[PDB]
Design a protein around this ligand. Structure first.
Ligand code: DGD
Ligand code: CLA
Ligand code: CLA
Ligand code: CLA
Ligand code: CLA
Ligand code: CLA
Ligand code: CLA
Ligand code: CLA
Ligand code: LMG
Ligand code: LHG
Ligand code: SF4
Lengths: 88, 154, 80, 42, 31, 743, 73, 147
């Protein structure tokens, strides 16, 4: 018998099968450090606008100032061009 | 001439094609024996080729720069053998078939189980009906004047 | 929810109610036919729209009609 | 025997025979008057 | 200072990025 | 309990009355037609025996006699083959010089100019070059005159009449009852030990007395007319002892157990015969002897009537463990009451067997002068691959039929079937995933390669020159197969095939019979493509079988049958939920997989195997060896395979290969014609037929059997039938024209 | 594909996939907001036809331009 | 409403992915939207026409600007039969060096496309001769798009 109108979640199976609920295994000197230094990146609108505009900044930057060893599109042609079937 | 086409008797290209095909055949021939059955077959084909080209020469067909025969269907009278008289033959035979079929359909339409005579033919009945197509034109004419060909009120 | 409508040409054969897989239809009393019966569709919020009822109706033209309309969870037949 | 006469008039057999005869007729015509492009008679 | 060196990237990379996040947030929003 | 013959007398009476009443078998068809739909149903349900009736006895009687009819047909086809070899062929001249005369056993009448199809096949003869490989069989048989071919044609005709009479007899006069059919132990004992054991024993006998000596004489150079007749070898034995001294002791060894003294003609050589490019006949006879012994022993496993033996029920009930509950208990009751379960298992095994036959016959050529006849080899591999694929797909069809019409946990419960049914969701989930992953990592590599080759970046490709993906295990295994003779097989001289390696190359008439086949990055890519296609086909067919009875979408699907169009447009739309539609979809994917298999084999053989060798010993392959570097992109398949090899067939007009040029185009047409049935639906067609019917009614010429548009399922079936015919025939014409033209 | 395969097959496949996802660890911490479903019938016809004619135009354009431009004559 | 799409309430209450698809493919069928009048339909269509006009002007603006900027026109006017007209430049970071060399033609200083729309012949036929005419026209088209 697995039907109980009082408790519905046990009848429809709302368990956490792998959760733990044990205390923290990262002793506080380590946790202390992280939750001090990693706080300013924890607001939704803040993080999103910052990530978008910073990624765009780095992309426009590294795109405008990439060197020839990287991108053959930058090194240009190095040969005299052919003529077409008639034209050229 | 008509549309610039000159006669196959006077066409040099028509001749060239004939002799090219003939001696290609005869190059394929020079083998197997001078009398074996393959040789006899190949010689029969050669003679048939000559007959074909000469018949197209006799019948006054028109040739172009390709060297092949062309067809004039405009109504000109020098060329009725090309389209109009075989066309009359076709229209006659086709009407024959269709007329016999419609008269069979009509003959069986009053049966209690008409579909039984559609998937299993009544051969003596059809045998009596086949030869009315011989005069299907006159019958169809007097059936049109009768108000009898077109189902009224459809 | 789809729409299901019953028209007065119904002969009250009940074949449509027997066919519904979600129990949309029902027979109700009437006076317009030899059977004194007519179909009704009281539970159209459960109709999946299979038209299994229309395949069963014998009148010409149909006496039950299914008009597909806005879709929901029950209408789409989703078990998740 | 009557049942056989009926069966022989069922649609597939009847059409098979009709077209085999027609095929023989056209084949023999073309074997006698080969390579016809026109009506060369009148 | 190369002009396509800037416009091709951002129209090709960041324009669709911002527009896809934009339209996702809009289209899954219940008012 | 015991096993015996059980038969009824005169169950049905021979009569013509049922011929004149179309659709006697089904009550619905018997009533007669109102619409044209009738005519279609009449043919679709003609052999659906277990739907015409409910009685198992009647279904089994019908099945037995139908099998006799099929065997009679096969005998008639064999009779035709032998008669045509005897009467309209150049077999004797080919027997005289096999590496110059190309075989031909069909001539055409000179009717409308078609005699051009009678081409110069050599030997003073003009006809159609055949590719079934029958001359090779007849030479390996010892046949040397056309009188023997006549004799076998007559014998086959007699056997066909005999089969037809037995088919009539076992249905109308002496029809066995259900208990006779349901005895599977005696049946297996007979087919294992009687059909397969005695069969290969008798055949080993014929090879020891006819094929071996006549082929010894033929390979010695003797004129095929001055060779003694086979029966002489049996009357006079000194003839045999001249070629094989061991035939002087004559069965004394076989009893004195000194089988060593037969090493004359029962060998274990391995490799090919360097004179004819085939397997040693002294190996094949010994093989058949061993196989006959094995089968004759294996046909004594099951208990019939004398206690000793094995009960199948006992074996099945004994097997079970802690993961499978009670498994195998209840399969004997199932496998003896449904014909569809049996048919599914049998079709699966026979299809797999046909594919294995294709591989083994290319890799270790059995007949003499077959390896250098390239057209026959291509034809045989391709034919048998197609047959195997089709049979495997039918296996799925009949598993689905069993699940819909026969599975019944109320009276025949099996545990394993129930458990698979209870986790089908996880099954289909994992198979779906692995097909997606396999498709990304094989076709994706091709797309990467095409894009890197078009972007002028060939050093970033997946190839032998830039980024290597060597199949280490395949190379390791064929290296083990190379070192096998002498180390793990001390009794063998050469290894099983020449594809394994060892540096041995066999030539015949200046042509290459066999040599070691090299495996490289391209082989790795092609094989993973193959794994991908097979996994997808399996997904479709197994999804069709496992969900044939019910789903989360349609929870009572078994009540709608096995072949139904849909369950209406509701629930979102439920077109093609039936299992028949899954078979219909799996046919396209089987076509895809087999087509890629035969393209891979055809290009690889020409590129690295076939060709011509010079007296100095420099092999020139048909294609230049471009498979290693052009097969890795899609553009190389379109350019170097399709465009470059279609030249032979698009240039055959005017030659004796022009029939292939006509069939190329006809097959393209039929393929494109099927798309009309596949892309449309019957509502449009019935509404158009309405107006056409009006026009006929206007002239009192309208038919009484009302014309309808085809069924929904019939539309799908016509579509897939024409699609498969068009595609396969296109490849048929392409292959045959190409291979016949170059050589 | 969209023109020969129709909807029911795909809808059943998708139900299987939804089960698979909801049952797997560390990935069921993510929840879609629209229940996935196969495409519609009319929608499938439209999408198939669009792919068909896009392919049509693109292949013919590529061939026409490359075979005239290659000869330039 | 309270969800995309606004014009259809029946689609907005659809909890499956269908809602999104059909939301896009019904957006310009104004007669099928909730609370549609005759005036709303006509006025919507009028504004839509104006939008399409702006679109066309911006597209032809783009063509003019781009062959005036990355183009070939001036050299083409000197010898229409012996030079290939340029459409625009190629900038693609997935290019390798040989492709870079392969697409550099028409006298350009880097990879380009050859035009086949025929606009050099048409503009040459009606009067435009130097790059300033093409720039002029492009700016005027931008103006007409805005209007
Ligand atoms: C040219 C100048 C001289 C001409 C002299 C020619 C003489 C005939 C020579 C050769 C004709 C060869 C073909 C003979 C017809 C085959 C017999 C037949 O089944 O044909 C028989 C039918 C019967 O004719 C009519 O047929 C009608 C239909 O009846 C039946 O017709 C069927 C008869 O089998 C069935 O019984 C069916 O149930 C029923 O429809 C009526 O019965 C009429 O009473 C009956 O007179 O036609 C007929 O007579 C035959 C009509 C042939 C006309 C051909 C003209 C030339 C071409
Ligand atoms: C597309 C336009 C067109 C059309 C419609 C025609 C039509 C015709 N042209 Mg013409 N022509 C054309 C363009 C055209 N031409 C052009 C552009 C040129 C310049 C090259 C010519 C040059 C040209 C020439 C030089 C001649 C014609 C002639 C003719 C007539 C020949 C056919 C005939 O004699 O009747 C038909 C012939 C019959 C014997 C009639 C029998 C048909 C039967 C009755 C019908 C069969 C029905 C069925 C079997 C039985 C009935 C059953 C019923 C009771 C239900 C014909 C009416 C010829 C002419 O003047 O005619 C004398 C002619 O000399 N044309
Ligand atoms: C519809 C006309 C049109 C079209 C089809 C193109 C197409 C192209 N442009 Mg161009 N452009 C145009 C108008 C157009 N442009 C106009 C009017 C100007 C100002 C005079 C420019 C200025 C411009 C520059 C400076 C560059 C390009 C570049 C490019 C190429 C790279 C792709 C890209 O980065 O997008 C275009 C990038 C832009 C910044 C264009 C912005 C200006 C237009 C008006 C944006 C229009 C967007 C609009 C809101 C949406 C309209 C709807 C419809 C087009 C879908 C590409 C082939 C790059 C190139 O040459 O590649 C090698 C390059 O760097 N364009
Ligand atoms: C609408 C399509 C069409 C048309 C109009 C034709 C027309 C023709 N074909 Mg052709 N054919 C076609 C399709 C077509 N064919 C197709 C699809 C194929 C591929 C299967 C062929 C393959 C083919 C071959 C192999 C040959 C022809 C030949 C011929 C010519 C035969 C003349 C003849 O039979 O003498 C006269 C016939 C009669 C007069 C019969 C009527 C007599 C009746 C029975 C008696 C009635 C008395 C009252 C003719 C002009 C032959 C030819 O000679 O080509 C030049 C021939 O060799 N055809
Ligand atoms: C040594 C005994 C023996 C042999 C040789 C065979 C052989 C065969 N059986 Mg069979 N069977 C046997 C015993 C045997 N059976 C027993 C004891 C039972 C159960 C009591 C069955 C029940 C059975 C069934 C239900 C079926 C077969 C079938 C077949 C055919 C399988 C298809 C095939 O491979 O064709 C190979 C073709 C050839 C080898 C050509 C040569 C044919 C020879 C002449 C066969 C003759 C063998 C036969 C037993 C002769 C007895 C008849 C005699 C009284 C006159 C095959 C010829 C299938 C069938 O009947 O197809 C018609 C099938 O449906 N068998
Ligand atoms: C079922 C297959 C089969 C059949 C029908 C025969 C039949 C025959 N064998 Mg035989 N044989 C066979 C298989 C077979 N063999 C196999 C597989 C081997 C290899 C072990 C041999 C090896 C063998 C030898 C060595 C001899 C025969 C001989 C004979 C003939 C002797 C006549 C007799 O006494 O009986 C006979 C016609 C004898 C013979 O040649 O007579 C001419 C003979 O000495 N056979
Ligand atoms: C030992 C082999 C075998 C056997 C005995 C059966 C037996 C049976 N099958 Mg089955 N099947 C098989 C193999 C086999 N199948 C294979 C290999 C496949 C995969 C394709 C299938 C797939 C399949 C399906 C999908 C179905 C069956 C069905 C059936 C049942 C009815 C068949 C029928 O009468 O339809 C009538 C037969 C025809 C109408 C003939 C069809 C003609 C084809 C389409 C043309 C082929 C073209 C030809 C080869 C070349 C062209 C010639 C032309 C140009 C002139 C029957 C019990 C049906 C069933 O309902 O089961 C209960 C069912 O629907 N089978
Ligand atoms: C694991 C890989 C492998 C394989 C596939 C084979 C396969 C084979 N070996 Mg072999 N062998 C192997 C490993 C292997 N061997 C190793 C590692 C050694 C030690 C170096 C040997 C030593 C060996 C010898 C001495 C001989 C063979 C022989 C044979 C052949 C006859 C098989 C046989 O006797 O039937 C099976 C026999 C049975 C009793 C059935 C047992 C079922 C197995 C063991 C499970 C056969 C093709 C014989 C041969 O040369 O054939 C001509 C033979 O003389 N092998
Ligand atoms: C040129 C080749 C064809 C030539 C046809 C010859 C002329 C045909 C016209 C006369 C037919 C006719 O008048 O019937 C006309 C037929 C109907 O037929 C009519 O039926 C009526 C009631 O029974 C009367 O009997 C009329 O006499 C009869 O002609 O219908 C039509 O073809 C339409 C025309 C107007 C009606
Ligand atoms: C260069 C710019 C190109 C756009 C020019 C066209 C705009 C001028 C005419 C518009 C008339 C507006 C009519 C009132 C319509 C109106 O403004 O009503 C406001 C609308 C509410 O809809 P309603 O309740 O009015 O619906 C009634 C409808 O029947 C009327 O269409 O809310 C929205 O804005 C939804 C936004 C979805 C936006 C979807 C994104 C679509 C992307 C592309 C959009 C066009 C870009 C084309 C570029 C390729
Ligand atoms: S009738 Fe055709 S389109 Fe409609 S649901 Fe059935 S299969 Fe699909």
């Amino acid at each position: 018998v697995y039907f109980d109108l009082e408790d519905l979640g046990n009848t429809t199976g709302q368990w956490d099968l792998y959760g733990s609920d044990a205390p923290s295994p990262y002793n506080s000197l380590q946790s202390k450090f992280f939750e001090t230094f990693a706080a300013p990146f924890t607001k939704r609108g803040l993080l999103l606008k910052f990530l978008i505009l910073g990624g765009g900044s780095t992309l426009a930057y590294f795109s405008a100032t990439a060197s020839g060893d990287i991108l053959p599109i930058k090194k240009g042609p190095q040969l005299p061009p052919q003529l077409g079937p008639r034209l050229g | 001439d008509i549309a610039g086409l000159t006669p196959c008797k006077d066409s040099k290209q028509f001749a060239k094609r004939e002799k090219q095909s003939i001696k290609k055949l005869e190059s394929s021939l020079k083998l197997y024996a001078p009398d074996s059955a393959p040789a006899l077959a190949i010689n029969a084909t050669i003679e048939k080729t000559k007959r074909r080209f000469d018949n197209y020469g006799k019948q006054g067909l028109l040739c172009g720069a390709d060297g092949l025969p062309h067809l004039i269907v405009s109504g000109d009278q020098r060329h009725w053998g090309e389209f109009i008289t075989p066309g009359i033959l076709f229209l006659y035979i086709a009407g024959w078939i269709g007329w016999v079929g419609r008269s069979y359909l009509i003959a069986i339409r009053d049966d209690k189980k008409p579909t039984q005579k559609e998937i299993i033919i009544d051969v003596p009945l059809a045998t009596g009906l086949v030869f009315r197509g011989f005069s299907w034109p006159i019958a169809a004419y007097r059936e049109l004047l009768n108000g009898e060909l077109v189902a009224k009120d459809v | 929810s789809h729409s299901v409508k019953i028209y007065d040409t119904c002969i009250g054969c009940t074949q449509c109610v027997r066919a519904c897989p979600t129990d949309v239809l029902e027979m109700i009393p009437w006076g317009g036919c030899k059977a004194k019966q007519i179909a009704s569709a009281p539970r159209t919020e459960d109709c999946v729209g299979c038209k299994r009822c229309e395949s069963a109706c014998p009148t010409d033209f149909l006496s039950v009609r299914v008009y597909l309309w806005h879709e929901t969870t029950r209408s789409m037949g989703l078990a998740y | 025997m009557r049942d056989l006469k009926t069966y022989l008039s069922v649609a597939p057999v009847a059409s098979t025979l009709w077209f085999a005869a027609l095929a023989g007729l056209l084949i023999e015509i073309n074997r006698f008057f080969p390579d016809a492009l026109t009506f060369p008679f009148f | 200072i190369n002009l396509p060196s800037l416009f091709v990237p951002l129209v090709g990379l960041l324009f669709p990025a911002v527009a896809m996040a934009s339209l996702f947030l809009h289209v899954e929003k219940r008012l | 309990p015991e096993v015996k013959i059980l038969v009824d007398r005169d169950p049905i009476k021979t009569s013509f009355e049922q011929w004149a009443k179309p659709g006697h078998f089904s009550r619905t068809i018997a009533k007669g037609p109102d619409t044209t739909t009738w005519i279609w149903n009449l043919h679709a349900d003609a052999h659906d025996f277990d739907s015409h009736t409910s009685d198992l006895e009647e279904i089994s009687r019908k099945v037995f006699s139908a099998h006799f009819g099929q065997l009679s047909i096969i005998f008639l086809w064999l009779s035709g083959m032998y008669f045509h070899g005897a009467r309209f062929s150049n077999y004797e001249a080919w027997l005289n010089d096999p590496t110059h005369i190309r075989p031909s056993a069909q001539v055409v009448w000179p009717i409308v100019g078609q005699e051009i199809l009678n081409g110069d096949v050599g030997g003073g003869f003009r006809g159609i070059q055949i590719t079934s490989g029958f001359f090779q069989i007849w030479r390996a048989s010892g046949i040397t005159s056309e009188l023997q071919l006549y004799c076998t044609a007559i014998g086959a005709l007699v056997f066909a009449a005999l089969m037809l009479f037995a088919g009539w007899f076992h249905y109308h006069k002496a029809a066995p009852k259900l208990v006779w059919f349901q005895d599977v132990e005696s049946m297996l004992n007979h087919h294992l030990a009687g059909l397969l054991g005695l069969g290969s024993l008798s055949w080993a006998g014929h090879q020891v007395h006819v094929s071996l000596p006549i082929n010894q004489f033929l390979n010695a150079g003797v004129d095929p007319k001055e060779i003694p007749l086979p029966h002489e070898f049996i009357l006079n034995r000194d003839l045999l002892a001249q070629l094989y001294p061991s035939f002087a002791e004559g069965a004394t060894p076989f009893f004195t157990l000194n089988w060593s003294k037969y090493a004359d003609f029962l060998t274990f050589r391995g490799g090919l015969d360097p004179l004819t490019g085939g397997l040693w006949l002294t190996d094949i006879a010994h093989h058949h002897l061993a196989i006959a012994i094995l089968f004759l022993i294996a046909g004594h496993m099951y208990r019939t009537n004398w206690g000793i033996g094995h009960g199948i029920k006992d074996i099945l009930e004994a097997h079970k463990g802690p993961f499978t509950g009670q498994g195998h208990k209840g399969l004997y009751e199932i496998l003896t009451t449904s014909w569809h379960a049996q048919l599914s298992i049998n079709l699966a095994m026979l299809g797999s067997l046909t594919i294995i036959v294709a591989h083994h016959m290319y890799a270790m050529p059995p007949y003499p002068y077959l390896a250098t006849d390239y057209g026959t080899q291509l034809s045989l591999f391709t034919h048998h691959m197609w047959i195997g694929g089709f049979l495997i797909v039918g296996a799925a069809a009949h598993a689905a039929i069993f699940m819909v019409r026969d599975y019944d946990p109320t009276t025949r419960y099996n545990d394993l079937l129930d458990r698979v049914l209870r986790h089908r969701d996880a099954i289909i989930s994992h198979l779906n995933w692995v097909c997606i992953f396999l498709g990304f990592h094989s076709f994706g590599l091709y797309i990467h390669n095409d894009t890197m080759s078009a972007l002028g970046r060939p050093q970033d490709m997946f190839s032998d020159t830039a980024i290597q993906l060597q199949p280490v295990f395949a190379q390791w295994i064929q290296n083990t197969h190379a070192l096998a003779p002498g180390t793990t097989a001390p009794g063998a001289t050469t290894s099983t095939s020449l594809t394994w390696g060892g540096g041995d190359l066999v030539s015949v008439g200046g042509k290459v019979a066999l040599l070691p086949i090299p495996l490289g990055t391209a082989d790795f890519l092609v094989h993973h493509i193959h794994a991908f296609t097979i996994h997808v086909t399996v997904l479709i067919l197994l999804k069709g079988v496992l969900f044939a009875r019910s789903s989360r979408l349609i929870p009572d699907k078994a009540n709608l049958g096995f072949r139904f169009p849909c369950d209406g447009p509701g629930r979102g739309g439920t077109c093609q939920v039936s299992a028949w539609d899954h078979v219909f979809l799996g046919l396209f994917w089987m076509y895809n997989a087999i087509s890629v298999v035969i393209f891979h084999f055809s290009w690889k053989m020409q590129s690295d195997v076939w060709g011509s060798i010079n007296d100095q010993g420099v092999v020139t392959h048909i294609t230049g060896g471009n498979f290693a570097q052009s097969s890795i992109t899609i553009n190389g398949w379109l350019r170097d395979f399709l465009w470059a090899q279609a030249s032979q067939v698009i240039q055959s007009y005017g030659s004796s290969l022009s029939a292939y040029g006509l069939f190329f185009l006809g097959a393209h047409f039929v393929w494109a014609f099927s798309l009309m049935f596949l892309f449309s639906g019957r509502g449009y067609w019935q509404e158009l037929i309405e107006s056409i019917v009006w026009a006929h009614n206007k002239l009192k010429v309208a038919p009484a059997t009302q014309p309808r548009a085809l069924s929904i399922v019939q539309g799908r079936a016509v579509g897939v039938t024409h699609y498969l015919l068009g595609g396969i025939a296109t490849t048929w014409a392409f292959f045959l024209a190409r291979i016949i033209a170059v050589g | 594909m969209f023109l020969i395969s129709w909807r029911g097959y795909w809808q059943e496949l998708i139900e299987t996939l939804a089960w698979a996802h909801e049952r797997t660890p560390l990935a069921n911490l993510i929840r879609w907001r629209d229940k996935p479903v196969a495409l519609s019938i009319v929608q499938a016809r439209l999408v198939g036809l669009v792919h068909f004619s896009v392919g049509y135009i693109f292949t013919y354009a590529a061939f026409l331009i490359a075979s005239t431009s290659g000869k330039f004559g | 409403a309270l969800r995309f799409p606004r014009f259809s309430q029946g689609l907005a209450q659809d909890p499956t992915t269908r809602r999104i698809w059909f939301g896009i493919a019904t957006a310009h069928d104004f007669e099928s939207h909730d609370d549609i009048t005759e005036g709303r339909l006509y006025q919507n269509i009028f504004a839509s026409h104006f939008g399409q006009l702006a679109i066309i002007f911006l597209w032809t603006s783009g063509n003019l600007f781009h062959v005036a900027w990355q183009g070939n026109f001036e050299a083409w006017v000197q010898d229409p039969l012996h030079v290939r007209p340029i459409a625009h430049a190629i900038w693609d970071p997935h290019f390798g060096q040989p492709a870079v060399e392969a697409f550099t033609r028409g006298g350009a200083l880097g990879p380009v496309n050859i035009a086949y729309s025929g606009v050099y012949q048409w503009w040459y036929t009606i009067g435009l001769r130097t790059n300033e005419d093409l720039y002029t026209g492009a700016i005027f088209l931008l103006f007409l798009s805005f209007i």
